[PDB]
Write an enzyme that holds these catalytic residues in place. Structure first.
Site, PDB file in Angstrom:
ATOM      1  N   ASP A 289       5.182   5.618 -29.112  1.00  0.00           N
ATOM      2  CA  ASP A 289       6.367   6.372 -28.590  1.00  0.00           C
ATOM      3  C   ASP A 289       7.678   6.035 -29.272  1.00  0.00           C
ATOM      4  O   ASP A 289       8.582   6.884 -29.307  1.00  0.00           O
ATOM      5  CB  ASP A 289       6.517   6.299 -27.056  1.00  0.00           C
ATOM      6  CG  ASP A 289       6.976   4.956 -26.573  1.00  0.00           C
ATOM      7  OD1 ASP A 289       6.591   3.984 -27.235  1.00  0.00           O
ATOM      8  OD2 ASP A 289       7.662   4.875 -25.539  1.00  0.00           O
TER       9      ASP A 289
ATOM     10  N   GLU B 288      11.480   0.592 -29.663  1.00  0.00           N
ATOM     11  CA  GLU B 288      12.116   1.419 -28.642  1.00  0.00           C
ATOM     12  C   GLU B 288      13.620   1.540 -28.809  1.00  0.00           C
ATOM     13  O   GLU B 288      14.170   2.650 -28.888  1.00  0.00           O
ATOM     14  CB  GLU B 288      11.850   0.807 -27.272  1.00  0.00           C
ATOM     15  CG  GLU B 288      12.351   1.601 -26.066  1.00  0.00           C
ATOM     16  CD  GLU B 288      11.988   0.873 -24.792  1.00  0.00           C
ATOM     17  OE1 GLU B 288      12.507  -0.256 -24.559  1.00  0.00           O
ATOM     18  OE2 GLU B 288      11.147   1.392 -24.034  1.00  0.00           O
TER      19      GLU B 288
ATOM     20  N   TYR C 249     -11.772  15.829 -23.125  1.00  0.00           N
ATOM     21  CA  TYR C 249     -12.396  15.756 -24.483  1.00  0.00           C
ATOM     22  C   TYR C 249     -13.319  14.551 -24.623  1.00  0.00           C
ATOM     23  O   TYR C 249     -13.329  13.906 -25.639  1.00  0.00           O
ATOM     24  CB  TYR C 249     -11.360  15.844 -25.587  1.00  0.00           C
ATOM     25  CG  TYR C 249     -10.759  17.176 -25.749  1.00  0.00           C
ATOM     26  CD1 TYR C 249      -9.736  17.603 -24.907  1.00  0.00           C
ATOM     27  CD2 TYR C 249     -11.233  18.071 -26.721  1.00  0.00           C
ATOM     28  CE1 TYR C 249      -9.182  18.870 -25.043  1.00  0.00           C
ATOM     29  CE2 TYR C 249     -10.701  19.344 -26.854  1.00  0.00           C
ATOM     30  CZ  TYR C 249      -9.664  19.754 -26.047  1.00  0.00           C
ATOM     31  OH  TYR C 249      -9.186  21.064 -26.190  1.00  0.00           O
TER      32      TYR C 249
HETATM   33  O1  LIG Z   1       7.243  -0.666 -20.389  1.00  0.00           O
HETATM   34  C1  LIG Z   1       8.059   0.396 -19.888  1.00  0.00           C
HETATM   35  C2  LIG Z   1       9.551  -0.010 -19.968  1.00  0.00           C
HETATM   36  O2  LIG Z   1       9.900  -0.932 -18.914  1.00  0.00           O
HETATM   37  C3  LIG Z   1      11.352  -1.087 -18.853  1.00  0.00           C
HETATM   38  O3  LIG Z   1      11.739  -1.908 -17.737  1.00  0.00           O
HETATM   39  C4  LIG Z   1      11.674  -1.329 -16.447  1.00  0.00           C
HETATM   40  C5  LIG Z   1      10.385  -1.841 -15.730  1.00  0.00           C
HETATM   41  O4  LIG Z   1       9.196  -1.184 -16.194  1.00  0.00           O
HETATM   42  C6  LIG Z   1      10.548  -1.458 -14.258  1.00  0.00           C
HETATM   43  O5  LIG Z   1       9.399  -1.740 -13.448  1.00  0.00           O
HETATM   44  C7  LIG Z   1      11.854  -2.137 -13.835  1.00  0.00           C
HETATM   45  O6  LIG Z   1      11.913  -2.162 -12.436  1.00  0.00           O
HETATM   46  O7  LIG Z   1      12.965  -1.373 -14.382  1.00  0.00           O
HETATM   47  C8  LIG Z   1      13.028  -1.686 -15.765  1.00  0.00           C
HETATM   48  C9  LIG Z   1      14.272  -1.075 -16.400  1.00  0.00           C
HETATM   49  O8  LIG Z   1      14.339   0.356 -16.346  1.00  0.00           O
HETATM   50  C10 LIG Z   1      11.916  -1.775 -20.121  1.00  0.00           C
HETATM   51  O9  LIG Z   1      13.368  -1.907 -20.038  1.00  0.00           O
HETATM   52  C11 LIG Z   1      11.439  -1.067 -21.397  1.00  0.00           C
HETATM   53  O10 LIG Z   1      11.702  -1.922 -22.536  1.00  0.00           O
HETATM   54  C12 LIG Z   1       9.944  -0.660 -21.322  1.00  0.00           C
HETATM   55  O11 LIG Z   1       9.535   0.222 -22.428  1.00  0.00           O
HETATM   56 NA    NA Z   2       6.694   1.555 -25.421  1.00  0.00          NA
END
Ligand SMILES: OC[C@H]1O[C@@H](O[C@H]2[C@H](O)[C@@H](O)[C@H](O)O[C@@H]2CO)[C@H](O)[C@@H](O)[C@@H]1O
Ligand code: NA
Ligand SMILES: OC[C@H]1O[C@@H](O[C@H]2[C@H](O)[C@@H](O)[C@H](O[C@H]3[C@H](O)[C@@H](O)[C@H](O[C@H]4[C@H](O)[C@@H](O)[C@H](O[C@H]5[C@H](O)[C@@H](O)[C@H](O[C@H]6[C@H](O)[C@@H](O)[C@H](O)O[C@@H]6CO)O[C@@H]5CO)O[C@@H]4CO)O[C@@H]3CO)O[C@@H]2CO)[C@H](O)[C@@H](O)[C@@H]1O
Ligand SMILES: [Ca+2]
Ligand code: NA
Ligand code: NA
Ligand code: NA
Ligand code: NA
Ligand code: NA
Ligand code: NA
Ligand code: NA
Ligand code: NA
Ligand code: NA
Ligand code: NA
Ligand code: NA
Ligand code: NA
Ligand code: NA
Ligand code: NA
Length: 701
Positions: free
Chosen positions: A226, A48, A392
């Site tokens: 992704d 990511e 599908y």
């Molecule tokens: O897995 C999706 C995404 O999560 C990200 O953290 C979020 C979390 O899902 C949410 O519930 C929290 O309250 O906010 C955080 C930060 O925006 C995380 O930072 C990503 O690495 C991840 O892909």
């Molecule tokens: Na991801």
């Protein structure tokens, strides 16, 4: 000036004083170490984060006309997180022995981690891998050119990097145990398992699978679909903005070719074949669902006596992981990144269409995007429930892959994908297409989504919510989805608020094509939990910006909704600037979930003892018996006991004393307030930086 704001944040992100990157030049998940959300430690990094770094350098490279930083970023990615090392040790040894007629051995997923390890029974023979031969003929190799998803950048788990020991950043894995294994409940282990840690003679393997023999030493990697797609989206833009070095363009093409492994059922089972509980192997591309599933994973033996390897696709697909800008880039002449394989571009062309259909299919009656679908109900090809909607021949899921928490609740999973559909509307219109079914789907989806989202964006005002996170109207009633939502609002200059989560109910209707779409009157999104997430703000801005811009390219002027989206974008960017602390644009967040640092819920099977990376015996003595209702028989330790070096973290003290003083273990509630943090997340700051950049590029010019 939005351009100057972009440059300022760019330099804050890049500055050696600020600590967003390691001494080896690798971006961390966050500056802060004590954080857990998907990586379980802030100085892990992810594919990511790499993909976002790429996006950042493309826009910087555009403005400065110097593409060196982009190339250095790609090189760094290749060196540390793509496990291909042509000129060093092989990081995928015995991939050459892969058998595309028997890609992997079947095992069931389980509804709780307690039911692992799962038997490698081969109950369902795996189907044919139909792209292995093309990849080999195209590149002279089947070594997977995709990012592994998770890197321990400071070697904080202490496993080291077996196949490349001079790199501090080590390949590590966590999630392995199904849909109830939250981030708190996984057990970090080395991707390259020579059995020097974990249980003697077994490593970590025997936590996860059982086979007749003692497990051999072995390696395995898992991408996140992704992330590699966003890397490709970035390079799409680079090429659109003038980048033309075929050395790197060709690498993006190759990545796209291998990313097709994301389009296959886990065990190459024919799509739909498990509807009635009796799957069967795919022939040709019969196991291709033409979506991006959650992952592809690949593995094989370590050492001279272990001359085997394997691949799995995945059966569960989440709307939030689709990237049709990548798909377009890989499938058209105008996209510019078509691979050289026989069917890479053409597979991606089909995916582009199927992705757009999936969004239209999943869109709720009020405009939010529901979770996704699976070809393997319960992860063991169970028969679909009576009346379950399908796409599908794949079953609707409100929370694909993970349930703790439910994977499509977070509002970030709306912003991320709709940002890309917005981009794609813009792309299509700029390329002269106002008439194709693809553009009409993209447009229709983003138009309805934008209408939807604008009800819950507040600038200079504070929405009224209740104690359970529901938005309230002017008569104080809960707003439980529906179009034309009118949230009560008090004056609050300089504040912004966005929605944090959605609570889903119902189903879409079964898909019969775009010309038959029903509008899904029985699928409801209740939007909730106002918060101040600056990553989500940045993603939304870009969604609104690209949507506005597309409407003007289409019609000659901002449309009615296009105007509103532009104004919302400009206003969010204006207010957000006040939250720059000199390192990033940030806000404070409460983390009621941080009791899970201390809760005993990390499962180990009975009879299993070994050594964790940090040197501690595991599960060790600090345990409780597992819950018999979850179907296992083993024990639970805690996240913190598993990771004793976390007690050396500078923030540990305050967290522990806040737990001790505010959390009630009896009621499971924080009584005197929850822990509070201000985080500088890499991806979030990129999403804010690129937001200023693109508003400048698309609207100012
Ligand atoms: O897995 C999706 C995404 O999560 C990200 O953290 C979020 C979390 O899902 C949410 O519930 C929290 O309250 O906010 C955080 C930060 O925006 C995380 O930072 C990503 O690495 C991840 O892909
Ligand atoms: Na991801
Ligand atoms: O005949 C030759 C020899 O065979 C040997 O036996 C082999 C056998 O041939 C082979 O088929 C077998 O393969 C299995 C592996 O052993 C096993 O490790 C593998 O498990 C998968 C698992 O099925 C899958 O569910 C899992 O997914 C995880 C993933 O790893 C993780 O990274 C991911 O994380 C995501 C997060 O959820 C998300 O938040 C974030 O954004 O992205 C992350 C990445 O997407 O989550 C998922 C779960 O959702 O991956 C593991 C692998 O890590 O399954 C294989 C097939 O069943 O191995 C055998 C050896 O053990 C014989 O031993 C020998 O005698 C013969 O000679
Ligand atoms: Ca759980
Ligand atoms: Na490498
Ligand atoms: Na560290
Ligand atoms: Na090395
Ligand atoms: Na290093
Ligand atoms: Na998670
Ligand atoms: Na094993
Ligand atoms: Na070159
Ligand atoms: Na190439
Ligand atoms: Na195309
Ligand atoms: Na729709
Ligand atoms: Na609406
Ligand atoms: Na509120
Ligand atoms: Na439908
Ligand atoms: Na949060």
């Amino acid at each position: 000036s939005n351009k100057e704001r972009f440059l300022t944040l760019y330099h804050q992100i890049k500055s050696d004083a600020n600590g967003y990157f390691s001494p080896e030049g690798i971006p961390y998940h966050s500056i802060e170490t004590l954080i857990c959300e998907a990586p379980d430690y802030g100085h892990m990094t992810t594919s990511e984060a790499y993909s976002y770094w790429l996006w950042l350098e493309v826009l910087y490279g555009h403005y400065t006309r110097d593409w060196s930083k982009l190339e250095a970023a790609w090189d760094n990615m290749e060196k540390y997180i793509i496990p291909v090392n042509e000129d060093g040790n092989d990081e995928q040894p015995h991939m050459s022995a892969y058998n595309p007629s028997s890609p992997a051995t079947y095992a069931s997923e389980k509804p709780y981690p307690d039911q692992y390890p799962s038997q490698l029974s081969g109950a369902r023979p795996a189907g044919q891998d139909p792209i292995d031969g093309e990849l080999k003929s195209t590149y002279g190799t089947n070594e997977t050119y995709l990012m592994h998803w998770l890197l321990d950048v400071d070697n904080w788990y202490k496993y080291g990097n077996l196949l490349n020991p001079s790199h501090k950043a080590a390949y590590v894995n966590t999630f392995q145990r199904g849909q109830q294994e939250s981030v708190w409940e996984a057990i970090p282990h080395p991707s390259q398992d020579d059995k020097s840690f974990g249980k003697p003679n077994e490593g970590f393997m025997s936590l996860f699978t059982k086979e007749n023999q003692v497990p051999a030493a072995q390696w395995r990697y898992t991408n996140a679909t992704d992330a590699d797609a966003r890397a490709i989206q970035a390079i799409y833009w680079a090429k659109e903005l003038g980048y033309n070095n075929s050395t790197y363009l060709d690498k993006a093409k190759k990545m796209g070719d291998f990313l097709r492994y994301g389009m296959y059922d886990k065990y190459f089972q024919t799509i739909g074949s498990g509807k009635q509980g009796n799957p069967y192997p795919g022939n040709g591309k019969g196991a291709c669902h033409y979506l991006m599933a959650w992952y592809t994973s690949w593995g094989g033996g370590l050492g001279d006596y272990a001359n085997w390897s394997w691949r799995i696709g995945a059966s569960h697909c989440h709307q939030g992981y689709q990237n049709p800008v990548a798909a377009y880039a890989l499938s058209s002449d105008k996209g510019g990144l078509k691979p050289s394989s026989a069917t890479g571009a053409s597979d991606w062309e089909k995916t582009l269409k199927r992705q757009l259909e999936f969004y239209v299919w999943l869109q709720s009656k009020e405009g939010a995007i529901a979770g996704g679908a699976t070809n393997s109900w319960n992860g063991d090809y169970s028969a679909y429930p009576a009346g379950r909607s399908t796409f599908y021949d794949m079953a609707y899921e409100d929370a694909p892959v993970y349930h703790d928490p439910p994977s499509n609740n977070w509002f970030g999973m709306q912003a991320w994908p709709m940002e890309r559909v917005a981009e794609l509307y813009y792309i299509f219109v700029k390329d002269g297409d106002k008439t194709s079914e693809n553009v009409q789907m993209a447009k229709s989806c983003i138009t309805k989504w934008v209408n939807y989202a604008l009800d819950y964006i507040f600038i200079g005002s504070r929405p009224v919510s209740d104690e359970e996170g529901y938005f309230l109207d002017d008569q104080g009633r809960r707003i439980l989805g529906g179009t034309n939502a009118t949230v009560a609002t008090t004056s609050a200059p300089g504040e912004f608020w966005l929605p944090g989560n959605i609570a889903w109910s119902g189903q879409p209707d079964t898909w019969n094509g775009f010309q038959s779409a029903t509008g899904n009157p029985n699928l409801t999104a209740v939007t909730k939990d106002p918060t101040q997430d600056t990553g989500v703000l940045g993603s939304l801005v870009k969604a609104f910006t690209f949507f506005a811009a597309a409407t003007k390219l289409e019609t000659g002027n901002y449309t009615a909704l296009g105007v509103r989206a532009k104004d919302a974008a400009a206003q969010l960017l204006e207010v957000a600037w006040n939250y720059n602390d000199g390192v990033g644009i940030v806000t404070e967040e409460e983390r009621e979930d941080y009791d899970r640092f201390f809760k005993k819920e990390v499962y180990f099977p009975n009879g299993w003892n070994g050594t964790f990376g940090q040197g501690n015996q595991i599960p060790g003595s600090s345990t409780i018996p597992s819950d018999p209702q979850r179907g296992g028989n083993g024990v639970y330790t805690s996240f913190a006991d598993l990771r004793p070096n976390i007690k050396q973290d500078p923030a540990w003290s305050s967290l522990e004393s806040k737990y001790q003083s505010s959390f009630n273990e009896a009621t499971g509630k924080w009584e005197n307030g929850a822990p509070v943090f201000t985080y500088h997340r890499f991806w979030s700051q990129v999403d804010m930086a690129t937001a200023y950049a693109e508003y400048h590029r698309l609207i100012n010019l």
